[PDB]
Symmetry: D2
Subunit: 175 residues, 4 copies
């Protein structure tokens, strides 16, 4: 019923930010309550010096607390998630993702950094006590033919996004 999407890219547009876009579209077409957040919504000073009294933080958190699931996306810098995504994740409370389904997406220069999703990003979401984390979707920069206006992906990438969004929705209303 309620989903947070979180773009983790330090720049806009991003190849990663556009994976999240396509999902947002496919999901809005279900009148599911979606709340998109990106890093451009926070003050750099609050994220760096780790200031928990961030007003932006309180509003995101309140929305997170009410969301049934999280779809989070990040470029792969230095064999992990962006540090910029991490500074925010660092501010969330200890059990922020408890009870929530999570869907991680990621892009990278090379397929050689595919394992950053499983070995860097998923443990962090797990530290935050995600109830369940999906397999997720990684795309090397070659699967994205255009991320500037409409996202164009290769059929393979689009398919893998479809499959994962499908799983994601079903997990979002188990009883």
């Amino acid at each position: 019923m309620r989903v947070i999407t979180l773009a983790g890219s330090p720049r806009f547009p991003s190849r990663s930010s556009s994976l999240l876009e396509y999902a947002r579209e496919k999901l809005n077409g279900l009148d599911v309550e979606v709340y998109h957040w990106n890093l451009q919504n926070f003050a750099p000073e609050d994220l760096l010096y780790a200031r928990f009294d961030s007003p932006a933080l309180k509003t995101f958190t309140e929305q997170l607390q009410q969301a049934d699931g999280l779809i989070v996306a990040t470029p792969v810098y230095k064999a992990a998630y962006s540090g910029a995504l991490k500074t925010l994740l660092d501010l969330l409370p200890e059990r922020a993702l408890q009870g929530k389904v999570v869907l991680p997406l990621a892009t990278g220069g090379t397929v050689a950094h595919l394992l950053a999703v499983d070995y860097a990003l998923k443990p962090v979401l797990s530290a935050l006590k995600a109830q369940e984390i999906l397999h997720g979707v990684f795309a090397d920069d070659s699967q994205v033919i255009d991320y500037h206006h409409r996202p164009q992906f290769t059929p393979n990438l689009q398919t893998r996004l479809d499959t994962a969004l499908e799983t994601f929705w079903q997990a979002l209303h188990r009883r």
Copy 2:
């Protein structure tokens, strides 16, 4: 509705096996068909030298195929899952865990190696294409009071298994 439990300890019984026995007991009470495997069901030479014509592997592959979920348990050695368990996971098909809900369990002599679950076991399960991996339970040895004749846990460890197992049951619907 079929679940596989898979013990990854090289000795049996073990602390991690007792977790699976407890899980079995809770799942049978809910009319799940549960099938238990351990490393002792395979010929060591088939595992260590990766021999794909292992009869047991064929049986275990079929059983897994038709299974909706997997509970896997391992002791933590050298900051990761056991080699012993990994020898078996290495022999499974590329997409063996596709469509499946996976509950990882582990035991460890020191709480210092709690992260072995997230940083070592989960990635390997995700390489087998697990559809979703539950948060899981790490138990330091001292939370497992008896593992030989009847699983007996401290209240906190018991409560955490119970919670995980309920999430696991719900996920299978």
Copy 3:
């Protein structure tokens, strides 16, 4: 001959920042060229939006490029290094640590996060092509009796720091 020390804590003082302090002292007492950098030396805006034209960045990089080794320290937030440390590491060039010995140090609330050094931090330094990375030192918050004025550690922590600094210096002048 030339070492960079890098505090990765978002706050000062930090339990982690003080591990780096004790090292800096022990090493200055050898007239080794040490260049201490912390996150307080960078503009939050540059680190977040990933601005490579950071003047602070150019000066750190130039000093890094000339350093024979790096000693880097971080608290353990969410089962990894701080995102704040990461935003900087994200800006360094692709092969920044090539040819250099690296010594990682870290602190955490609980010993349960000891493995964050090996599974989160070391891969990032390795992505940066560290020639060699030392075993390193992790300390739970209980090993630090006081980090505010002089660092007080338990003998065990001090010993483990000594052992690692020893190894560190020897590796810094192989021929």
Copy 4:
């Protein structure tokens, strides 16, 4: 000056073994005493069921003890080192790699699993208390032209091994 090479492939020869043979050849040329082990030197049942009285394990432990460095090589399976190799690492003493310089090598069917070295193999070596772990070499299968009768690599893979091996030699001084 003693080096152990340790092949972690479950079949022999393998692509990762050919790397170690190449390394051996380069190290002997520099008057290093090199001792080679592989998984076939151990009884599978001792590895898979973690039996510490394995004679081979005793010999390998002694040899490692007196060794200054270790070159270890493994294929990448299910996004990590081989279970087969891990069964052996799990049987080594707690501080087995203390004081030692370690050079990790790996091979993989897809470059997609290059990070298995940093995210999986290194942590386990560091749990054995390796004094320093070199950057290492990942080679996708296609860079290993022959591994059966004479190690034969593409120029780039050969150049990267050469560089690593020189760093390794210097570190042993």
